[PDB]
Symmetry: C3
Subunit: 411 residues, 3 copies
């Protein structure tokens, strides 16, 4: 199914180059890279909760103690003190709170990894879809330009006839109005082409000088040959975020249980900075502490409610993502299955209108039909030719819609 570099299947080295440029260096690329690195840093920070912490502390203080407060034998006046210690703290994690925190953070990272794939897909498909439109525009340009050549040929026939007393000025004027209108349409298409090149340049992270070297597409379209949702990075990301939320419910539950910590220090403390290192002025301690909240008035309880709510939200978000992915795939299937008959009937309208015009103009070049018959046929032909070109372009768009709906093929 969809390749990793799936755009290569269209055999357009243009398209290949545009996507390749965007995926090597472009702002959308860099932002996606950055957002993944962010999640990596966040995961790293979270994992620290399961380590011990070590720090060095030192102080020098000039202090005067109250004479009648907490010491029966306080030193007199202002004296200097110093300390210099190595300090240690470790949280025991008896209920798994901190482990759950790390699982939540790593689940977020897994979601971030999936989102980086989704970002690659969003870049490549945004370019391919813009390219599809460029191709559609160039097709409409060819169709309208060819019609213009004909409209001009009709004016000049009708003018030669009018000159020889074989046609009216009304017909001539109408034909000139038709030709001017078709040319106006062509100019609009040509503007759109250039606008679309500008957009492609921006999509690949470049200024508008990149647009100057964009040429007519040459796309080769080949027919291809619930279980279909496993390459959807959005579903994967939402899965992992629902896992992270579940873990956060666990954290909130574990906050009701005793927290057991271990602290320690070792170093020197002295009355007199010049005595900091004297024999006997070492100090140290180690021991566990436990804290058990007994009544918080709603803090622990409310936090648990909020964590449950976030889990429920995340599950609903996952469900929504599944529903939306199935909708997207269902639509691609619907439209893909409808396309051939649409094209078929529109081809038939083109061909019958082309016959109509051929007969109308033969008859005109021989004085049996009016100019009006020609105008009506010309208009019907052009309208159907444009409809056809747009449906042919739709085949490419639908192939791209399938690739998007399947989530690409990054692997």
């Amino acid at each position: 199914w969809p390749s990793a570099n799936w755009w290569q299947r269209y055999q357009d080295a243009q398209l290949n180059h545009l996507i390749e440029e965007a995926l090597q260096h472009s702002p959308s690329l860099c932002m996606a890279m950055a957002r993944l690195k962010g999640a990596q840093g966040f995961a790293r920070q979270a994992g620290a909760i399961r380590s011990f912490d070590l720090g060095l502390a030192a102080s020098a203080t000039e202090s005067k103690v109250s004479e009648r407060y907490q010491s029966a034998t306080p030193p007199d006046g202002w004296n200097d003190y110093g300390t210099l210690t190595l300090n240690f703290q470790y949280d025991f994690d008896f209920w798994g709170k901190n482990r759950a925190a790390v699982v939540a953070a790593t689940s977020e990272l897994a979601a971030a990894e999936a989102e980086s794939v989704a970002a690659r897909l969003m870049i490549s498909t945004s370019i391919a879809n813009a390219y599809a439109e460029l191709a559609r525009l160039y097709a409409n340009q060819e169709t309208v330009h060819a019609a213009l050549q004909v409209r001009n040929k009709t004016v000049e026939l009708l003018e030669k006839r009018y000159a020889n007393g074989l046609e009216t000025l009304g017909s001539v004027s109408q034909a000139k109005a038709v030709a001017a209108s078709v040319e106006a349409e062509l100019l609009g298409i040509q503007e759109s082409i250039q606008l679309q090149k500008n957009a492609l340049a921006a999509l690949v992270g470049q200024g508008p000088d990149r647009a100057a070297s964009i040429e007519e597409p040459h796309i080769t379209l080949t027919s291809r040959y619930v279980g279909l949702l496993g390459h959807r990075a959005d579903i994967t990301a939402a899965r992992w975020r629902a896992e992270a939320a579940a873990q956060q419910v666990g954290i909130a539950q574990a906050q009701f249980y005793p927290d057991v910590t271990l602290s320690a220090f070792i170093g020197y403390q002295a009355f007199g900075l010049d005595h900091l290192f004297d024999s006997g002025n070492d100090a140290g301690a180690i021991g566990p502490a436990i804290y058990l909240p007994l009544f918080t008035g709603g803090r622990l309880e409310g936090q648990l409610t909020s964590a449950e709510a976030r889990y429920q939200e995340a599950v609903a978000q996952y469900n929504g993502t599944l529903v939306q992915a199935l909708h997207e795939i269902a639509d691609v299937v619907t439209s893909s299955q409808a396309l051939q008959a649409r094209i078929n009937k529109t081809e038939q309208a083109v061909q019958q209108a082309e016959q109509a015009l051929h007969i109308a103009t033969n008859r005109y070049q021989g004085g049996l039909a009016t100019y009006l018959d020609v105008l009506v046929a010309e208009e019907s032909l052009l309208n159907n030719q444009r409809a056809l070109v747009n449906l042919q372009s739709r085949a490419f768009s639908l192939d791209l819609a399938l690739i998007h709906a399947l989530g690409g093929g990054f692997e």
Copy 2:
């Protein structure tokens, strides 16, 4: 005005069932439920600030004191100590800071309650609007299919005539081009119908198998029979959020004032863990503390500026919501008042075009008018019939727009 289950007024048990399904269980539903529960948990957490807090603390420590630091008679060497205490803390709230915090949180909850109603409205109206489009599509299907039957009948008349030397091949070819084009339009409509069923399935939280049982709508539209803004949950929510912001200004102001707290503990402390419970090794304390910031270099001041700014923003947000609600209601009124005359003139175009076609085809079936007169009339008729069906559908859309603009009728 708008009922609680307002969609029932259209007398389409289909529509009723789709909305009912979505409101019983669907991802959009669940996310809305979850976001309300979240606000409930947040409110619960906030209310804790006005309670006292109670906790149990215990520790066992092996400690060596410096010989010449803070004790004139320090114990020698490394000794074991233990503590086990019940701890209590209460913030007095003399300036109402904490009360304002709870008012802010409960105001947010009231806003969240209003937003849950808005979410129900967004679900039901999104479904009804998608349904409106489904109905419009089925109407265009009937209109275009009926026209197709006629186009085919015209081909086969013109072919019988051409066969008998009474018509040209040009006419025949044009008529076939017209019929193929009308059929191509029909196929496009039929695709849209299926796409719209897919969308309805997704809107009610279901996979695309739900779409398979969606049938043609049968909507019954009945005419109905600043003060009109009280069912707007968005205005209510913004109201309450502006209240919450106002309270937060109060909090920021109160941070300049003295904070008075009460702390207490009771328990046991001992040199020697085996002596933890000995007579005389109980320890306890109670008392108030007061802290008054005297200079913070911009922390309190900046926090007040930020809180005032948030209030101003929230008031502007409320004002914007009022303006937008009035715009929405004004537009519904504008369009509702315009609709009948639009329909009237478009009905007149339909009927006159239908007469034109009838005369053109009678005249054709008797050799007085061209095929061209028939083509022009057929085209004019179909264009006007589609315009009419779209305006008739607009009546339903406008009724739904009114319900949305009034904020529904949940009560």
Copy 3:
């Protein structure tokens, strides 16, 4: 180039008044003001990190000390204690962490200042663009109303003719269908005009009574006469945010280095509240402390990774903004350069169609051409006249697009 009050160049005091109203008082205005004040408050709060902090603390405690814990000569029973102190804290900032924090906050403020300019631009251009559409609608109203007068004149000619046996009922019916359709189009345009007035009222922060005094625009369009990006407030804001992020990388780096603080207090502490102020019960201290983290298990490291990621994101965001601004300017140039030829060819279609109609109707008023020739010409004329009016309106839209792309002229 673009003035500060650039809309004045269109010489429409209407437009001037609408924009002026919105910029004096409107919800969008107020929200923008509020968001700037917020950033000001945040900057103020951040700057506090470089000041010292002063506070007053007092306590009164009833306390019972354990007999055999930490004092060899503990007081007996429950006794009262009091304290009353002035407390001082100052962070030294040897590595520039706190300075970087303030630079980051002031850079955010500079970005907020730029965004307030962008908000002014978004307000004025949203109004001008809505006004452009209002003008376009009024032009289409004039064009369609004038065509309607003609369509009605054609019905009544064809009816007088049909009455005298000189025309068919088919022609009459077709002409009536055409007129009804043109009137239906007019009614739709008139609805749109009123909807557009409603939108303008909302855009200037007013209820729908403001819409009642909005009249036909009278815009005067005058031709004007990478380096072009310096008035883009979005680029400026993104610049400053990338600076703020860079500083935050510095903060994260500086967190690995020793933190040196200074603390002090002075006051009174006493056993016996009635002795709080007794000679010798003063207490005080001053001194520096240093903390150096030695191992944090990923906290410092992960924070640095996250800060680098945010910098990278912000740089990419800046780059994206540059690319998007260049795209916007490139499009304005593309479309501006295309416009004249589009208008020219469309003017030619109008004029030739107008000749066609004139000849068709002269010939009709003299029995040489059919009604059909008239219908075809009338339709072609109207279609081209509307296309022209829309292209003329486009000239105004493009001028506004240029002003937007250049970022206005606030100075």
